[PDB]
């Protein structure tokens, strides 16, 4: 079609130059001619796009199409003497429609220098091995007979090697295996056997609280989740229960030493819990179950303090609003529990260690709630209205957070 530029834009340009009182036939004369030149160049810039095999187009085809038609590719200035700026281009003008039209000179020094990317290098692979395309990451995707297992003899050997490496006898083995679990494209159709190995393992691995066996299985869950190829929400009925017992069970090992170890498993569990729910959250179901169960676990009375600490951590890592609504009306209860452990001379229990960990975690979460939607003031004895747990030390932590914010 001969869709030309509008003539009511050409009269604006003419009267903003000193040429007033132009006729419509004078003004139409320019539009047909100008549209052809734009059409002549865009058909000629198409040559450089097809020959450079650019496709995505790097700001520059019109610069060579203009130079081909013996017109300067310069945009934003025309030199009638032609000598300082010949047919070499200046890369156009980085201008916008929604721009500010007047910035600060100090703002452009603040503009960070972008990183120069990597230089062009030659790496080699395989599109086809004697006719078959490999699944490497450089590639896109009445007596009767006996049945066969749906896994190959190699795939089954791969499953055995990956599972015997993921029980963490050697770090190198476990790490490489975890990477393979997080990158294998063909790890679907083996995923029932991995989910069953995880689920079954945690349940017979909490009969005796074997922390490594559990920390390795949680890392296997995390390596299963970030794999982009496999479809996971047909198997989370076996995953969530595993992370649940890694957070809300009775763990009676070393009171202080194992608390550190089991708190790393707690961190893993709370993180992988939200990611699992994120991959399947539609309406109610998983999110509703998690919220109701966590609330019931918290409101339990005389609850094991290991279970208490794990459920506290799980409730805390749920995001911005969840602690904004679920960690408000229970501040008095948390203080009462800490006071109960403080009274008495018994220290050979895990109840005291559990109490210290719970109080520290709750106090840090309160700090963003104080920072996010409150203004600091009276940081000396106002916290005594919240049983006086962290008080001035909590105020000092808030001050350190404010200093970090000032540094940012």
């Amino acid at each position: 079609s001969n869709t030309v530029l509008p003539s009511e834009s050409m009269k604006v340009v003419a009267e903003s130059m000193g040429i007033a009182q132009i006729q419509e036939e004078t003004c139409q004369l320019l539009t047909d001619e100008v549209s052809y030149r734009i059409k002549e160049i865009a058909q000629d810039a198409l040559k450089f796009m097809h020959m450079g095999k650019r496709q995505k187009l790097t700001t520059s085809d019109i610069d060579y199409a203009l130079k081909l038609k013996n017109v300067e590719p310069l945009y934003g200035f025309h030199a009638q003497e032609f000598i300082p700026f010949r047919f070499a281009s200046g890369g156009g003008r980085e201008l916008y429609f929604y721009e500010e039209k007047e910035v600060d000179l100090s703002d452009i020094i603040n503009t960070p220098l972008p990183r120069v990317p990597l230089d062009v290098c030659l790496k080699a692979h395989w599109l086809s091995i004697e006719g078959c395309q490999p699944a490497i990451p450089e590639n896109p995707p009445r007596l009767k007979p006996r049945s066969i297992h749906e896994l190959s003899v190699e795939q089954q050997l791969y499953y055995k090697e990956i599972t015997e490496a993921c029980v963490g006898s050697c770090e190198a083995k476990r790490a490489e295996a975890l990477q393979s679990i997080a990158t294998d494209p063909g790890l679907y159709q083996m995923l029932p056997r991995f989910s069953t190995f995880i689920s079954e393992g945690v349940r017979v691995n909490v009969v005796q609280n074997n922390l490594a066996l559990l920390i390795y299985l949680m890392r296997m869950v995390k390596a299963l989740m970030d794999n982009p190829t496999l479809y996971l929400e047909k198997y989370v009925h076996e995953l969530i229960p595993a992370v649940m017992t890694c957070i809300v069970s009775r763990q009676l090992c070393l009171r202080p030493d194992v608390d550190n170890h089991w708190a790393l498993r707690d961190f893993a569990a709370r993180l992988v819990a939200q990611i699992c729910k994120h991959f399947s959250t539609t309406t109610n179901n998983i999110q509703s179950r998690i919220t109701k169960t966590f609330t019931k676990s918290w409101v339990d009375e005389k609850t094991p303090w290991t279970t208490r600490y794990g459920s506290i951590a799980g409730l805390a890592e749920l995001g911005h609003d969840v602690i904004k609504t679920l960690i408000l009306p229970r501040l008095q209860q948390e203080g009462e529990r800490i006071r109960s452990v403080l009274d008495g001379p018994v220290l050979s229990n895990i109840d005291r260690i559990g109490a210290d960990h719970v109080q520290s975690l709750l106090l840090k979460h309160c700090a963003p709630v104080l920072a996010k939607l409150r203004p600091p003031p009276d940081n000396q004895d106002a916290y005594r209205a919240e049983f006086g747990s962290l008080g001035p030390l909590l105020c000092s932590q808030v001050v350190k957070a404010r200093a970090q914010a000032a540094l940012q």
């Binding site: 349940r203 047909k234 198997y235 009925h237 399947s280 998983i286």
Partner: peptide, 25 residues
Amino acid sequence: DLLADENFLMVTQLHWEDDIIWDGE
């Protein structure tokens, strides 16, 4: 709504608290 395949996702049809034996006999 009801025929929606997500509803039949085994995670959205199973309560995990009951799944765990949790040292119970």
